[PDB]
Known about the structure:
With 113 residues, this protein is of the alpha+beta class. The protein is built from 5 helices and 5 strands; from the N terminus they run H-E-E-E-H-H-H-E-E-H. Keywords: Signal.
Amino acid sequence: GASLKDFELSKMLEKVAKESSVGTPRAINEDILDQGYTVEGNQLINHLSVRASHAERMRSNPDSVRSQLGDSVCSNTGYRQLLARGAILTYSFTEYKTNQPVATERFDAGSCR
């Protein structure tokens, strides 16, 4: 099992996941639903669904997707506090109709540097 400190971090992340999930699912735009947050170990995971056409645009340029996500995460004051405590921010995008993976992008303190 996870160490005492690791399990505690997961519990802290679960508090963030619960508050951040209030009001989800909700539309980010016409193509993307914010489905809220879960925690797996040291990862705070934001789950999002993406419609088929936008999913294709995402798949065609995964480095640009990652870079834009990184810019957002790494300048988010609250996320920076989590990364500063050993957390990983994970974005899990799946297809709206099928739930097939589209993109999965993880960020740690190292990523932000």
